[PDB]
């Protein structure tokens, strides 16, 4: 499944980035899970994940840096709390979890460059 996302996004001065990850039409019954993975210096870590039905606001873990909504064949994401050290490639993994058959798609990732604000 093709997963599309912007190649580059510059985090705001407040450490926030907003982008869209588009994929195949999920339908209304299919349970979808989006997982954001951060790749940096050849290392991969899971940033956040949410399981949802098309058309709903996403529910990420509490104190999570991710928020978003699901509309049509895409998830509209916002990642906040970013710092220069968090610069990296943010990859969207979208899985069709239920009902069978299990299937998924992975994007090429959105490179997010983060610059820390000046002490004033």
């Amino acid at each position: 499944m093709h997963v599309a996302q912007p190649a580059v996004v510059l985090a705001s001065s407040r450490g926030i980035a907003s982008f869209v990850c588009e994929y195949a039409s999920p339908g209304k019954a299919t349970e979808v899970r989006v997982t954001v993975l951060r790749q940096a210096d050849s290392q991969v870590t899971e940033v956040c994940a949410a399981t949802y039905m098309m058309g709903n606001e996403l529910t990420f873990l509490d104190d999570s840096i991710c928020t978003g909504t699901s509309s049509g064949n895409q998830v509209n994401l916002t990642i906040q709390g970013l710092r220069a050290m968090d610069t990296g490639l943010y990859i969207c993994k979208v899985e069709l979890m239920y009902p069978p058959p299990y299937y998924l798609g992975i994007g090429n990732g959105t490179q997010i460059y983060v610059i820390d604000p000046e002490p004033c």
Binding site: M1, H2, A24, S25, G27, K28, A29, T30, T35, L37, V44, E46, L96, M97, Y98, P99, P100, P101, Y102, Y103, L104, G105, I106, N108
Partner: protein, 173 residues
């Protein structure tokens, strides 16, 4: 613009399906569908699905997947349909009169391979798929070739067919 589900008359049903021989682990050797898309830049890892038989004749269906630094298990229930070899979702009633789900075992020899058809129908869309399972991670070339022809016979171009890459992580547990 999604390829429409083929008429069920084009999807064979395994004759005299034996539920007490179909249980166990099945590796996903091939997968095709109107939402499946082959991309050599993003090869799909193989996963397995375990069919555990219940007293009421339905199956608990557990898919074992290799995720980020961990193994995961999904769960679903296949409830016997009108004919042996056909099933529907255990919670299908919670979706509404406009939603239907059909599982049809197309062909299987129980100890080598199995071809299964899935169809999720909703008010304004239909999503279908075909999978070929193996008791092992690999299947004879001819079996896979027939799967491709069968997929095409259902209106699926070759790029809507993927053959998951065998892995050793989590799917053998």
């Amino acid at each position: 613009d999604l390829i429409p589900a083929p008429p069920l008359s084009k999807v064979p049903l395994q004759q005299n399906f034996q539920d007490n021989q179909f249980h166990g682990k099945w590796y996903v050797v091939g997968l095709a569908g109107n939402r499946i898309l082959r991309d050599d830049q993003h090869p799909m890892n193989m996963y397995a699905t375990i069919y555990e038989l219940k007293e009421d004749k339905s199956y608990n269906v557990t898919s074992v997947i290799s995720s980020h630094k961990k193994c995961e298990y999904t769960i679903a229930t296949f409830v016997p349909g009108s004919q042996p070899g056909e099933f529907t979702l255990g919670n299908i009633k919670s979706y509404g009169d406009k939603t239907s789900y059909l599982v049809r075992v197309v062909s299987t020899d129980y100890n080598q391979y199995a071809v299964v058809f899935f169809k999720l129908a909703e008010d304004n869309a239909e999503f279908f798929a075909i999978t070929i399972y193996g008791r092992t991670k690999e299947l004879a070339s001819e079996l896979k070739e027939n799967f491709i022809r069968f997929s095409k016979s259902l209106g699926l171009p070759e790029n809507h067919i993927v053959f998951p890459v065998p892995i050793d992580q989590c799917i053998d547990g």
